Design a protein around this nucleic acid. Sequence first.
DNA 1: ATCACAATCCCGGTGCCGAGGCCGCTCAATTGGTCGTAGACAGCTCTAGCACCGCTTAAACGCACGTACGGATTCCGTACGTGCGTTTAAGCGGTGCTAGAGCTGTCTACGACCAATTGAGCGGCCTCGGCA
DNA 2: TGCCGAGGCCGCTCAATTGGTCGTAGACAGCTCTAGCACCGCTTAAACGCACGTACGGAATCCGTACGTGCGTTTAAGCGGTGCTAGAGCTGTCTACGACCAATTGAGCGGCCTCGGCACCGGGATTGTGAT
Lengths: 78, 78, 96, 91, 102, 96, 91, 90
Amino acid sequence: NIQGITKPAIRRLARRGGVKRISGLIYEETRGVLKVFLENVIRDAVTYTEHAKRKTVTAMDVVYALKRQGRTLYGFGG
Amino acid sequence: DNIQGITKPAIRRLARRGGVKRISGLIYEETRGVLKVFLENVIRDAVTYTEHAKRKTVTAMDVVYALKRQGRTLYGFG
Amino acid sequence: PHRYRPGTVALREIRRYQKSTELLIRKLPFQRLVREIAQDFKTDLRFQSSAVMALQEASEAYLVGLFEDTNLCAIHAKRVTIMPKDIQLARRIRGE
Amino acid sequence: GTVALREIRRYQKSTELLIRKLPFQRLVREIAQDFKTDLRFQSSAVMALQEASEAYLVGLFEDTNLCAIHAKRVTIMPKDIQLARRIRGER
Amino acid sequence: VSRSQRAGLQFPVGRIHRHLKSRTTSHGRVGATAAVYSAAILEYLTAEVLELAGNASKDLKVKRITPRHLQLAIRGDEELDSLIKATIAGGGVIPHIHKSLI
Amino acid sequence: VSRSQRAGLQFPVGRIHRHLKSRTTSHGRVGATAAVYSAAILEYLTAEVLELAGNASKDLKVKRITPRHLQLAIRGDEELDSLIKATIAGGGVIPH
Amino acid sequence: RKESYSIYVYKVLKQVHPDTGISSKAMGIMNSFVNDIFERIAGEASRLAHYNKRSTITSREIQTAVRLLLPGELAKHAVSEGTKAVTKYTS
Amino acid sequence: KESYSIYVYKVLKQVHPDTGISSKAMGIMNSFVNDIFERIAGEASRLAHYNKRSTITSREIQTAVRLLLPGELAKHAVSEGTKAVTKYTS
DNA sequence: ATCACAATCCCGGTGCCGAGGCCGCTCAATTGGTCGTAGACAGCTCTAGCACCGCTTAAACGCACGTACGGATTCCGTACGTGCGTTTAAGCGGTGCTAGAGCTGTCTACGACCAATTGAGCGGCCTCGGCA
DNA sequence: TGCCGAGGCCGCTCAATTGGTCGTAGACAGCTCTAGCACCGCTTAAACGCACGTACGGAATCCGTACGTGCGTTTAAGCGGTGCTAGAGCTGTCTACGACCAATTGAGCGGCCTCGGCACCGGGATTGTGAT
């Protein structure tokens, strides 16, 4: 499912970063990077959700986890 | 002109402890500017802390609080 | 037959995707990935659509900034091609 | 390049300060003069400022050496300091 | 007769006071002038960011401020860039291609 | 019977309760077992750090802990390095 | 009920831009910005009250907090606006 | 002035019975303990704020520890806190 | 320097969904006394910060000398980019079902406060073993 | 080889423990209506595999310079003393304004409605690309 983040998607994310030539080994490394980031944020989101005794994850859990990690996000209620 | 009081051998020592093996002669001016900027920020915050307490002597507490504001937490004086 | 010399379409894509504001990862694959990742921490979870949207936006911003730092690292080595070692250097200097 | 390595080992071995106390104290007082006229400093404040400054500069030099190694060089240059301080966001 | 009107502001002094008393520590109080100062600060900061975003929107010949214009305004000023370090949702990035790439 | 003995700890439950009450819940109240849990966490972390520092000191063949040993212990563990990121006055640097 | 900062942000916008509008997404962004900056200022004020062993938050503490967070050329103007508001309110 | 010197010394002599500590290391330990306590208190108060609660309990401290400490440290800290609370209630 | 061409900007139309304004109600901002308690203010003091001077000497500085290293040049093969044909899996609209988040009412476990007692931390003095 | 510091005995003093009171925070049960999840059919678009070819990374070579090392002279840092005085810290007074409370009324939060500004399509105008 992490393979579902396709090569053209990483190419587009690189184009938005101004990258003109992309090595053929970039994509696996970027997949690892994204997996680590998501694992770090989702863990705190689920921690908040479990503390609230809820079975659902809300946008505010994600926003609080991101603010905790140092990646404050604007436009989702926090 | 006391910024020149940070002598070149002292900058060499700081670079040696950091693992730098060979140093360009243009490094010293860059290091002096970097140190001046850092010192300016920390001292500004410390002086603000001193002023809010209506005093004329800068304690170690003011320096520690100013450093903590910048995310440069320092143990041993707090 | 018309062929553009390798390097022109890359710049055209750079301009196009730096002009837009949309998301660049497909929605359904990212939702599937998020659900599978969260499957480890908890069983039988539920995700508000806004939770997945916030996660996707945070991930996209993080990856874009990381790629910009990587491009700086690559240009530093007198290159034009970004490489895994430049990603690693960008991540290490950042502290991550 | 032998004495450089010996000094590298010796300086990572020890724990003392590397900037002389009086020049740094004069620098600190001159910097603080522009913020509030007629300020005084405890010895603890100046010592803490020196400790923080030395740690900061050593870490920055580590990052700069990494940038230099990246470009297949061994001599650090101002460009490496600038890249290190731009990636961190210190600029 | 409202406290903000006596202070000549738009942001509410009273509601800001109520939110301030709910942030203090035990046996803590909040002066009535702290709300005045905080309301003035918030009004000034919002005015600055909104004026910059309005200029950015006027450049693109539009009548509505979007996340894109907020990102353009914030990332185009050094003070607001340093102070605001958040991920504006749907704001994209500022276009810039390095010279050595062309 | 002090609450520490009831909890079987070494840190002061009463003083930690007072300190938690000072920061409070923004004019609220603090539960009974909050102090016990906080004291337990503080004791565990201090025990871990001091054990590592004592091992470092014994490896250096000395009978007293110094800030150098504290930094040697902290930087020698991944998780203690992640949790603690402060500058320790008088500790030097890890050889590399 | 869920209170929000939409009214005052719209009032400020129509004060400084009597022809431009704002979006729902921009409204949410401004809500988040105001909430975050207010939280930062309030936290700094609380810490400042604790440091001097006080218990009353005062406009002196808010001024010092604004001086601590906001970068230069913003601290000056923000402090000017706050002082003007305080002086008018006392009048 | 209040300090954690005696409790830190007791913990030290519990771990290493034949090791002493210098004054500077005591200062380092005092600052470290104060910093960790400040972090835990702030996280717990914020957690009370988010869920519209007014009382800090064992659950808030447990979630704060789970959020702040990394990996195995969180697991063992949670275990020790649970043991202490179960002993206290008994 | 010239010129055909894929590609992008500009202008015009449309019709669709979101902003902006208006109503009603309700929750909280505002007012007036009471009271007390947290802080501004005046003194005292004795701590510690600062301004001199001598002097010892270890650190810094100026100069010479040689070689290790960074930068320009050249060359070449392979990894990338570009475009085309096929396909395959996302996106949209509709349908249905059900877990579960959210509000409300009771009440019962729990924590704050005060008066008394006492016991565990904090500072003082000292010294003999760890350390530079 | 001592000297310079940490571990221990001792002085009280402030806060931690008991216990009863009393209000209230939240645990729990119950119901409601939202919203998350699952399935299905089309259908246009994006992804994937492939062929071909130019640009680019990386290596090898050469050379000039710039950086490290050593030596001798100079200097100013650090130690060690000395008087001296602001001012940080503590005590005590008295008081100025913020919290609690009761009553009340207006500003803002949901809900709704409407039109106009932004989004997509389509056709000319332009503008770098790339062979000539």
